[PDB]
């Protein structure tokens, strides 16, 4: 394991030089994240909001993840992936300056209201389009869940929160690391087996359950207990199974497949006729907190 000094030096070569407090002001904390805190700030010259994630290099279990997030954000851009404007080192902190997405996170929708199948298909389609491109390059997100799905003001999906991502290669085609969010984790990953991009497809299935049911399976169990049930049991069932179409159930059945070798890929899923239901971005807008009644 390389020293802090050597890790920082490596990271320093890939981030933008300088101090971002020269450009940004009016910092407001908005959250505790997956490897740090998240703020909003205004860019001095425009008065435009940006999001800024701050991660302490010295308080990370897997520092390499900081490096991964920066490099993947720099090199693998997509219309359905959150944009990184710049990154900086400020002492022993990594700051990542991101676009601010006015729609907020999908979690806020699934916990406050009920999506219809056209809306569910729109979200799935957009996530799958991003994943197909990312997976083709060996990038694994490893933390798919509604919290990682952000929405623009006009209802477009942006996959976000690459703080736990990895990249596989011909030389090192699988990862073994037990990482993610307990209730969303793929059974192969919980089992600490060599895994690949397929883990994201399972996680997406659990997010479909969120979109139908409001919460993932086993959410009331201690995390290690939930992980045992995902590992050992038949795939989780929709609590609101009675509400769903044959197309949706057929779709979900291709995601929540325990053997990763039998699980559908993102590229296969883009052709599933459930996604023919997808509404446009205008269909998501009324779900967002700023438009909700009640």
């Amino acid at each position: 394991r390389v020293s802090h000094e050597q890790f920082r030096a490596a990271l320093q070569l890939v981030v933008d030089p300088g101090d971002p407090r020269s450009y940004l002001d009016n910092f407001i904390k908005i959250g505790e994240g997956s490897t740090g805190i998240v703020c909003i700030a205004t860019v001095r010259s425009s008065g435009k909001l940006v999001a800024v994630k701050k991660m302490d290099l010295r308080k990370q279990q897997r520092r390499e993840l900081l490096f991964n997030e920066v490099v993947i954000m720099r090199d693998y851009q997509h219309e359905n992936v959150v944009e990184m404007y710049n990154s900086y080192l400020v002492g022993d902190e990594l700051w990542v300056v991101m676009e601010f997405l006015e729609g907020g996170a999908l979690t806020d929708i699934v916990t406050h209201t009920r999506m219809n199948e056209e809306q569910i298909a729109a979200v799935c389609l957009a996530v799958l389009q991003a994943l197909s491109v990312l997976h083709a390059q060996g990038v694994i997100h490893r933390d798919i869940k509604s919290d990682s799905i952000l929405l623009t003001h006009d209802g477009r999906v942006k996959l976000s929160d690459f703080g736990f991502c990895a990249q596989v290669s011909k030389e090192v085609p699988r990862r073994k690391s037990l990482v993610g969010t307990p209730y969303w984790m793929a059974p192969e990953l919980i089992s600490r087996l060599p895994y690949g991009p397929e883990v994201d497809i399972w996680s997406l299935g659990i997010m479909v359950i969120e979109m139908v049911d409001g919460e993932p399976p086993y959410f009331n169990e201690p995390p290690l207990k939930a992980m045992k049930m995902i590992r050992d049991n038949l795939p989780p069932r929709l609590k609101n199974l009675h509400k769903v179409s044959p197309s949706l159930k057929g779709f979900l059945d291709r995601l929540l497949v325990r053997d990763p070798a039998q699980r559908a890929t993102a590229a296969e899923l883009l052709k599933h006729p459930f996604l023919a239901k997808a509404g446009p971005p205008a269909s998501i807008v009324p779900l967002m907190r700023q438009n909700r009644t009640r």
Binding site: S34, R62, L178, N220, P223
Partner: peptide
């Protein structure tokens, strides 16, 4: 436990 935090458990 209804916690939504991402976690690194092991390499």
């Amino acid at each position: 436990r209804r916690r939504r935090r991402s976690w690194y458990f092991d390499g």
